[PDB]
Design a protein around this ligand. Structure first.
Ligand SMILES: NC(=O)c1ccc[n+]([C@@H]2O[C@H](COP(=O)([O-])OP(=O)(O)OC[C@H]3O[C@@H](n4cnc5c(N)ncnc54)[C@H](O)[C@@H]3O)[C@@H](O)[C@H]2O)c1
Ligand SMILES: NC(=O)c1ccc[n+]([C@@H]2O[C@H](COP(=O)([O-])OP(=O)(O)OC[C@H]3O[C@@H](n4cnc5c(N)ncnc54)[C@H](O)[C@@H]3O)[C@@H](O)[C@H]2O)c1
Lengths: 382, 385
């Protein structure tokens, strides 16, 4: 049980990268690549595009190739698959694999609409022997683990506020024109929220809990020739009375990336997703208020993860679950938290109203489908 | 006239400060004409500290006395428009304190009154407009040098105020006394500044928590989203329960970025090329990769701190100068309504849980305020029309 063979569905940008990581062919001069994880190997490659097949024949000549991912699953050349394909296919593949005893590592975001993701979760719960995971690779980052640990420990008391401005992923019209599926309601089901935002959206929920209510201002085609949102401002509320805000866009040439958490007993500020300043109050504010600088102590944490580290670490973690039951950092059921939040943001955005989180699945789907229909590029979803 | 005598209505903390500045216990064109307070203790203090300065219980008597050439409304906010309107109708120059008023209806009436008596000088104490820091940022934005604004965000949590502070004043933090908490107290100078530099929001969405970690009925934790005619967005966050509050004001523009830290220091980033230009170039991913990794932007730094009394005296002097020789006002009183409307819109959004257009319906706001006043039971309900 030394190694788990992985089949990549979609040898696109992400799929290609994964293939390189598994093969040890990942490194670019000027880019260290993480070595192949011990328990991981590349079993097979699947793509519907002939050009991709040609590339696969060239770069990976001795690696079995399949046009149809169902054929790859049945081949027994692979022990698990990774869904590096457009998001709409994620739950479709997952459900099929769970029903056919095939371990599935689903890419972010888990899916486009919460209904399909819920079905996937229920399917997995009904085939528990099958390993079911999501590629929330940022959970392998010691930075976010550090912040989660401190918050969850209750050492700094309860959260009162979170604020994350993350504007540093500039993407011009030229980038948007590169992919047909990306930035299309029918292709992606959204823009920034379904692409750049999901890892962060999961992280925010993972560290700060899941918002009870979502209010969002979503601008479609902000300084860009697309129909989907790429400038988003969100307000959230939480069971315990805390508030939150999240701001992101793809038109900022010099975007802030600053994540603040304010707590009863301290404060955390994370800059550029690398460095965290942790402030511990000598006394909780509640205590200070009751009474009627030397007052705080500051701790610093910095971590940067090298190319391939996060994805390989997930791959290895996932393999290990299959092999010896090691717990998953990213159990696939968790994928729905991020999808629900993205859906709630979009629906708030579309209706101009605050919404409870999660939103009604059918209401979201209708509004998505309406947009898909108008776009006319892709089939509506049932 | 060489000097304008000022009558202070409300020798409270602000009134006292002003009195000191003018006594030198002064700006060249400014003097203290008279003091007015309804509290006997204040009168006694005024007799002690300012024995040669005429004192009046009734501010209407002070106005008519001809001991003063202008008045300053250092009294609870509900009186601001009442005094202003009276003074405009009686040819008396009036410098209205922040916020201009509690509810927009009364402030609008004040503005219309002033517009009907234009010979009377009408001003507001937006003393932060005298701060070279905010002047610098306004100038750059308004010049169009950095192109249009796309986003503003101001987190300002550094005015920690515990329950003990709230207990100090009966009028403060009461719907009937103040008409709000953080929005009517700490927030107004900032709210004006935000509007002054970034324009006035078309729409306001707000999350306002009453009695956040505090034993008060009014809001003291506020998160706001705004939209603007030109498609920009904005956010404003403030509260009085943060022991170590951020104060960071960011403006993102087509052609640069501004970040102001702790209300003292500004970092100005000027893009070599505007984003619109970069987008038009349709640069390839390698070029995009080069962008994100300092060559693209240049940084300028600006820092100013204003010493005690500078801002208030400078306004006083500016105001006097308008009366004397027509010098333009840095803070024309009509502008006071921008901040009041925004505060009202924030509150009303907060109360209804819905986005609102700015400005909101005056009667709707007043009703919701009055409902809260009635429940509080500390003060009489306020009725206009
Ligand atoms: N975990 C992460 O950090 C991360 C990073 C990037 C992308 N991803 C995820 O990977 C997915 C997209 O990969 P990408 O962004 O490289 O897209 P891409 O367009 O570069 O690659 C997709 C490939 O899938 C192929 N394809 C589409 N439908 C197929 C099908 N039914 N069978 C086989 N091949 C099919 C296409 O031919 C294409 O070659 C998305 O879910 C994205 O969110 C995750
Ligand atoms: N511009 C600034 O920097 C700044 C700073 C603080 C306060 N202020 C403003 O000053 C005003 C008062 O605030 P404060 O902190 O001085 O409060 P305060 O309660 O200390 O002072 C108000 C004073 O007015 C008196 N008063 C009430 N009704 C009166 C009446 N009818 N006639 C005469 N006196 C009357 C009270 O007895 C008291 O002495 C408010 O509008 C506040 O917004 C402005």
């Amino acid at each position: 049980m030394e190694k788990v063979r992985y089949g990549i569905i979609g040898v696109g940008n992400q799929g290609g990268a994964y293939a390189g990581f598994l093969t040890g062919t990942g490194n670019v001069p000027g880019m260290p690549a993480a070595p192949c994880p011990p328990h991981c190997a590349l079993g097979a490659l699947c793509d519907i595009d002939p050009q991709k097949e040609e590339m696969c024949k060239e770069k990976y000549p001795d690696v079995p190739f399949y046009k149809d991912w169902k054929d790859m699953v049945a081949s027994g050349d692979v022990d698990a698959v990774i869904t590096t394909v457009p998001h709409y296919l994620h739950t479709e593949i997952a459900i099929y694999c769970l029903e056919h005893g095939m371990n599935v590592l689903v890419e972010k975001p888990a899916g486009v609409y919460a209904k399909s993701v819920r079905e996937m979760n229920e399917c997995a719960a009904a085939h528990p022997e099958v390993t079911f995971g999501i590629m929330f690779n940022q959970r392998t980052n010691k930075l976010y683990q550090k912040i989660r640990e401190i918050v969850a420990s209750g050492e700094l008391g309860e959260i009162r506020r979170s604020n994350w401005i993350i504007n540093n992923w500039y993407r011009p019209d030229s980038y948007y024109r590169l992919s047909d599926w990306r930035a299309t309601w029918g292709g992606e089901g959204g823009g920034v929220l379904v692409n750049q935002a999901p890892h962060q959206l999961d992280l925010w929920q993972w560290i700060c809990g899941i918002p009870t209510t979502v209010y969002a201002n979503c601008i479609n085609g902000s300084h860009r020739d697309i129909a989907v949102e790429n400038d988003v401002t969100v307000l959230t509320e939480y069971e315990n009375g805390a508030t939150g805000s999240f701001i992101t866009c793809t038109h900022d040439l010099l975007g802030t990336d600053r994540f603040e958490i304010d707590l009863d007993g301290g404060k955390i500020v994370v800059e550029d997703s690398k460095k965290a300043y942790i402030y511990r109050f000598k006394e909780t504010e509640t205590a200070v208020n009751a009474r009627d600088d030397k007052m705080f102590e500051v701790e610093e944490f910095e971590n940067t993860d090298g190319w391939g580290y996060q994805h390989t670490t997930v791959m290895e973690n996932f393999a290990q679950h299959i092999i010896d039951g090691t717990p998953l950092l990213a159990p696939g059921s968790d994928g729905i938290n991020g999808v629900r939040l993205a859906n709630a943001i979009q629906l708030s955005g579309w209706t101009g109203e605050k919404v409870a989180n999660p939103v009604d699945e059918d209401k979201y789907l209708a509004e998505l489908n309406k947009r898909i229909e108008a776009e006319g590029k892709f089939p509506v979803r049932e």
